Amino acid sequence: ATINNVTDLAIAAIQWSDRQDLTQELLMLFIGNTTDRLNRLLRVRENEHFETLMAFGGGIEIPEHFVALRSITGDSLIGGRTLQYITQDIFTHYVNYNYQPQGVTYYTRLGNFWRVFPVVPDGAPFIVNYWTVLPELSLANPTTWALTKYPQIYLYGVLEQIYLYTMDEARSQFWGQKLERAVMELQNEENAADFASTRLAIKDIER
Amino acid sequence: ATINNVTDLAIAAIQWSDRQDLTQELLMLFIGNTTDRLNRLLRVRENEHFETLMAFGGGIEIPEHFVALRSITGDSLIGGRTLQYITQDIFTHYVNYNYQPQGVTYYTRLGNFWRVFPVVPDGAPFIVNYWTVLPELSLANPTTWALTKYPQIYLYGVLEQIYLYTMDEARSQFWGQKLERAVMELQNEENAADFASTRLAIKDIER
Amino acid sequence: ATINNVTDLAIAAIQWSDRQDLTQELLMLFIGNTTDRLNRLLRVRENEHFETLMAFGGGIEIPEHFVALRSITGDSLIGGRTLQYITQDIFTHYVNYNYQPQGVTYYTRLGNFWRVFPVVPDGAPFIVNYWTVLPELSLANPTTWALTKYPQIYLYGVLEQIYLYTMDEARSQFWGQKLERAVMELQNEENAADFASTRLAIKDIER
Amino acid sequence: ATINNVTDLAIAAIQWSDRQDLTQELLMLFIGNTTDRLNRLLRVRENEHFETLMAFGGGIEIPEHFVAL
């Protein structure tokens, strides 16, 4: 509720800032700036995504909207194991010494690709769970989950952008602090969704 | 997303700065200055590049776009070993005492060249993974990945350059702080892309 | 790109400072001052140089462009070793006691010459790797590598020199800080070119 | 009873050590090392075999799995 789509957001921003001289292009630019800033800070459940990817040429291509990786799991037909990260030197040693484990076990990052050690023929399926970027807010995409989840974030971001544009500094920094507080509150709520999971997903390969 | 090409960036910068005395040449100069400043700070995934180089005269010529080295690996035919850095006097000792390992294992830097110890004939292929400079943004090259990834960086940099040009310093510091915050945000986001890989690439050969 | 040669640099300096009363001689003096200041602060790969030198009269003459020494290596005909530094007292003791090692091993600095202990006949070749001064920027030398690599350094240095000449305080400090920050950024980028080499060349000979 | 096969042993080791980074190959190597160590210590009824051999060339060939006579 509250604010439903982009047009109401623009109307509310105009009403609050009283600046009736702002064209729609400037409002679109402000919203784009706000969502671009959001894309670098939010790692929440609605942002997560898991899907099946093919392996071709001994590697997996990173998705275009990838922002952070959570897990890679081999298919049960190819071994059904959760992959582990190794450096380039370990990969070279394994290749040279012909390790030959039972199934796909290790992976490393090379350029824009994930290379798995027990090199498999083309067509190997993997399950990748990762994080994407927030959907763009525009006329073609009137509604997003972020807008319907917490409209204050977008309202405060647009207000801060407006006061930056009008070359005012006190209100600009005030609204920037407000937006940062809202983002921190949302991230904190997501972080404390389950108490048990907080401790885990931290300690991996210590020795 | 938001700003797409160089012309849109120039229009947005002119609108935000509210100035009208800026010509095309000044805008190009400001954009070039921002790109040159960015070239000294960003080491991200899109900045990486790996390619095959031929060794001639017992050495490999450093590419002209080189800014930082990630790894050098020999070809499987020549040994397929990940090279290790050695100091010049160690190189001299190895040459004098005829160490004679199996493949190419060591390398050092001399002038603009990388010299490998087990001197190989001309034509030995190597795989070099390193970082390059950001692509030039101009009329002939109106689009880059940096612009489409985070336009706020370019917008703030151009605004700071503009305010520097007009003999105003306080707002120059304001926009410079904004730009450096954006750059730090982008770099920090890239650093935590893979949590598992963060622990490695920190400590090597300690003894 | 950006700024190509000295004439464009002077034009840009005039445009930014708005001081159209400055003659070409003053601009040349400012550029020379900036280059002289740079000569005492930069040790970069582009500044490195290695070459073969003759030994005359039991010594090697220091090159006129020498700023800092990296390594001296004897030719394979005279031992092919990497020389080590010894003090005057050790040199005198070695001479008096007729140490007589196999090849040339030690060197010391006497006045403007490098004296090697196992005194060799005239014409002994050595390979010296060291650092030089930056190329002079003037009308006879319109372009240098420093200008084409980072024009901001020269622009900021010229602006600081101009504001020193016009006898202004705040802007002089501002532009001096900007130039120092640019120089520090360039040096830091050079230092972190290869992470592996950072550990070495630090802990050498403790006893 | 208790632990019945190798998979139960691996699961118990994972649970007790609390180490989720252990692969199958490392566990197999650990089990093999334990068995090799046990091979030099245990002399029990289940480890004992009696069988009929034929003497050829005035001699008896030692069995391949022989550890003690």
For B172, list phi and psi in degrees, rounded to 5.
-60, -45
Q: Which residues contact A92 (CB under 8 A, 6 or more apart)?
A: B73, B80, B81, B82
Residue from the list C2, C150, C193 with its beta carbon closest to the beta carbon of B68: C193
Asked whether A105 and A118 are in contact (CB, 8 A), the reply is: yes
| Cβ-count burial D16-32 (b if 16+ within 10 Å, e if not) | eeeeeeebeeeeeeeee
Quick one: tokens of A72? 């890679």
Q: How many CA atoms lie within 13 A of B45 on its CB side?
A: 20
Report the distance separating Cα A146 and Cα A31, nearest Å: 12
Cα–Cα dist A47/C47, whole Å: 49
Q: Which amino acid is at C112?
A: N
User: How many H-runs (helices) and E-runs (strands) does chain B carry?
Assistant: 7, 7
Bridge pairing between strands C113-116 and C106-110: antiparallel
Rounded CA separation C142/C136 (Å): 9
Q: Whole-angstrom Cα distance, residue B55 to residue B74?
A: 10
* Nearest neighbour of D21 by CB, restricted to A101, A102, A204: A204
Q: Dihedral of CA B9/B13/B16/B19: which sign? A: negative
Cβ neighbours for A203, distance < 8 A, ≥ 6 positions apart: none
Give Cα D48 distance to the centre of its chain: 14
> Dihedral angle at the C-alpha atoms of B9, B10, B15, B21, nearest 10 degrees?
170
Kindly state the helix (H) or strand (E) to which residue C25 belongs, with its residue range: helix C24-39
Cβ atoms of residues A134 and A38 within 8 Å: yes
SS (H, E, C) C80-116: CCECEECCHHHHHHHHHHCCCCCCCCEEEEECCEEEE
Of A68, A136, A204, the CB nearest to B192: A68
Angstroms from C47 CA to nearest CA on chain B: 9
Question: Coil, strand, or helix at residue B114?
Answer: strand
Q: DSSP label at B193?
A: S
DSSP readout, B137-171?
-SSSS---HHHHH-HHHHHHHHHHHHHHHTT--HH
| Closest-CA distance of chain C to residue B69, Å | 6
Q: Compute the nearest-CA separation of B201 from chain C (Å).
A: 10
- Hey, what amino acid is at A112? N
Q: Are C and D close enough to touch, i.e. 3+ CB pairs under 8 angstroms? A: no
Nearest by Cα to B70 from C54, A163, A111: A111
Residue A121 amino acid letter: P
Residues B37 and B157 sit within 8 Å (Cβ to Cβ): yes
Helix/strand/coil for C174: helix
C chain contacts of residue B84, beta-carbon cutoff 8 Å:
196
Q: Which residue of D lies nearest to A106 if distances are taken between CA atoms?
A: D23
Partners of residue D20 in chain A, C-beta under 8 Å: 204
3-class DSSP assignment, residue D61: coil
Q: Do B2 and A67 touch (CB under 8 A)?
A: no
How many interchain CB pairs under 8 A, B with C? 69
Q: How far apart are CA A192 and CA A153, in angstroms?
A: 20
What is the spatial order of strands in the sheet that B124-131 belongs to?
B48-55, B124-131, B68-74
Residue with tokens 């510091």: B173
Judged by 3 or more CB pairs under 8 A, whether A touches B is: yes
The continuous run of DSSP H or E covering B54 comes out as strand B48-55
- Can you tell me whether residue D7 is helix, strand or coil? helix
For residue B86, give the nearest of B63, B117, B58 by alpha carbon: B117
Q: Where are the alpha helices (DSSP H) in B49-126?
A: 88-97
Strand order across the C68-74 sheet: C48-55, C124-131, C68-74
3-state secondary structure of C138: coil
C115: β partners: C59, C108
Residues of B with CB under 8 A from a CB of A: 1-3, 12, 15-16, 18, 45, 48-50, 71, 73, 80-82, 129, 150-152, 174, 185-186, 189, 192-197, 199-201
Q: CB of C154 within 8 A of CB of C178? A: no
SS (H, E, C) chain A: CCCCCHHHHHHHHHHHHCCCCCCHHHHHHHHHHHHHHHHCCCCCCCCEEEEEEEEECCEEECCCCCCEEEEEEECCCCCCCECEECCHHHHHHHHHHCCCCCCCCEEEEECCEEEECCCCCCCEEEEEEEECCCCCCCCCCCCCHHHHHCHHHHHHHHHHHHHHHCCCCHHHHHHHHHHHHHHHHHHHHHHCCCCHHHHCCCCCCCC
Question: CA of A92 to nearest chain D CA: how many angstroms apart?
Answer: 19
Residue among B154, B12, B38, B150 at smallest CA distance from A133 = B150
Residue of A nearest to B15 (CA): A165
By the 8 A CB rule, do A96 and B78 touch? Answer: no
Give me the DSSP letters along C43-79: --GGGEEEEEEEEBTTEEEPPTT--EEEEEEE-GGGT
CA A49 to CA A130: how far, in whole Å? 6
As beta bridge partners, residue B53 has B126
CA C197 to chain centre: 20
CB B37 within 8 A of CB B182: no
- Residue C19, both tokens: 């001081």
Whether residue C10 contacts residue C155, with contact meaning beta carbons closer than 8 Å, is answered with no
Separation of alpha carbons B158 and B167, rounded Å: 15
The technique by which this structure was obtained is cryo-EM
Q: Tokens standing for C185? A: 């950024």
Are the beta carbons of C50 and B84 separated by less than 8 Å?
no
- Which letter, b or e, does each residue of C138-156 get, where b requires 16 or more Cβ atoms within 10 Å of its Cβ? eeeeeebebbeebbbbbbb
List all residues 6 or more positions away from A75 whose beta carbon is below 8 Å from its beta carbon.
Answer: A124, A125, A126, A127
C-alpha span between A4 and A151 (Å, rounded):
9
Enumerate chain B positions whose Cβ falls within 8 A of a Cβ in C.
29, 32-33, 36-37, 40-41, 62, 66-69, 84-85, 87-89, 92, 95-96, 109-112, 136, 138, 165, 167, 169, 204-205
Residue B124 in 3-state DSSP?
Answer: strand
Q: What dihedral angle (degrees, nearest 10) is formed by the CA atoms of B154, B156, B157, B158? A: 80
Residue of A nearest to B200 (CA): A87
Taking an 8 Å cut-off on Cβ atoms, the answer to whether A95 and B80 are in contact is yes
Quick check: B120 and B55 in contact, CB under 8 A? yes
Q: How far is CA B41 from the centre of its chain?
A: 8
Nearest Cα to Cα of residue C91 among C116, C112, C113: C116
Nearest to A146 by CA among A157, A138, A155, A154: A154
CA atoms within 13 A on the CB side of D40: 4
Q: How far apart are CA C47 and CA C130, in angstroms?
A: 9
CA angle (B8, B9, B10) in 5-degree steps: 90
> Who among D20, D21, D24 is closest to A102 (CB)?
D24
Cα dihedral angle (A183, A188, A189, A191), rounded to 10 degrees? 130
| Chains C and A, touching by 3 or more CB pairs within 8 angstroms | no
Instruction: Measure CB to CB from residue B112 to each of C45, C171, C186 and give the nearest one.
Output: C45
If you measure CA to CA, which chain B residue comes closest to A87?
A: B200
Cα separation, A100 vs A34, in Å, equals 49
Q: How many CB atoms lie within 10 A of CB A111?
A: 15
Measure in Å the smallest separation between the Cα of B83 and chain A Cα atoms. Answer: 9
- DSSP-derived letter for residue B134 is P
Is the Cβ pair B85, C200 closer than 8 Å?
Answer: yes
CA C145 to CA C132: how far, in whole Å? 13
Nearest to C133 by CA among C27, C38, C61: C38
In the chain, the amino acid numbered C168 is: D
CB B62 within 8 A of CB B83: no
**Owner of token pair 């035919």:** B77
Residues of A in contact with D25 (CB under 8 A): 101-102
Minimum Cα–Cα distance from B30: chain C residue: C2
Beta strands in C87-198 (DSSP E): 106-110, 113-116, 124-131
* CA within 13 Å, CB half, C48: 13
Q: SS3 helix, strand, coil % of chain D, rounded to 5?
A: 40, 5, 55
**Contact yes or no for B88 and C81 at CB 8 A:** no
For the CA atoms of A65, A71, A72, A77, the dihedral, rounded to the nearest 10 degrees, stands at -130
- B11/B142 Cα distance (integer angstroms): 14
Both tokens of A20, joined, read 């009736």
The minimum CA-CA distance between A7 and chain B, rounded to whole Å, is 17
Q: How many CB atoms lie within 10 A of CB C9?
A: 20
Distance from CA of A185 to the nearest CA of D (A): 32
**Residue B2 DSSP SS3:** coil
Say how many C-beta atoms besides its own lie within 10 A of residue A126's C-beta. 21
- Give which of B121, B120, B122, B123 is closest to B107, Cα–Cα: B120
Q: Which two tokens stand for residue D37?
A: 């160590």
CA atoms within 13 A on the CB side of D51: 11
For residue A45, the distance in angstroms to the closest alpha carbon of chain D comes to 24
What SS3 class is residue B72?
A: strand
Q: Do A68 and B185 touch (CB under 8 A)?
A: no
| Pairing mode of beta strands C68-74, C124-131 | antiparallel
Measured at the CA of B88, the angle between CA B82 and CA B90, to 5 degrees, comes to: 75
Q: Could you tell me if C164 and C173 are in contact, meaning their C-beta atoms sit under 8 angstroms apart?
A: no
**Contact (CB, 8 A) for A33 and A179:** no
DSSP B186: H
